[PDB]
């Protein structure tokens, strides 16, 4: 029925969904541990 077909080019990629939450700090209130998380989450988006 046909000769010249179409073929995809670029490979499929992946995305990180979920991770262990692991951080640290060097003692700045005690909530900054929390705020730094959202920071380190906002990166992956």
């Amino acid at each position: 029925e046909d000769t010249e077909a179409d073929v995809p080019v670029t490979y499929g990629e992946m995305v990180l969904n979920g991770a262990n939450l692991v951080t640290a700090l060097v003692m700045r209130s005690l909530d900054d541990v929390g705020r730094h998380l959202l920071e380190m989450q906002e990166e992956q988006l």
Binding site: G18, A19, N20, L21, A24, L30, D31, V33, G34, L37
Partner: protein, 49 residues
């Protein structure tokens, strides 16, 4: 499924940093350091009585 979270009420104490000069024992020393001791053979200390 799997789940995750983080508290906001309680934070850990991982390290307990103990310095020797914070102790009361550091009287009984004379803590002078070399940055070169491994290069040294028999060193000597003199006394005149």
């Amino acid at each position: 499924d799997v789940e995750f979270d983080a508290l906001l009420g309680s934070y850990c104490n991982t390290l307990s940093l103990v310095r020797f000069l914070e102790l009361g024992l550091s009287v009984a020393c004379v803590c002078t350091k070399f940055p070169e001791l491994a290069y040294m053979n028999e060193g000597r200390v003199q006394f005149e009585v």
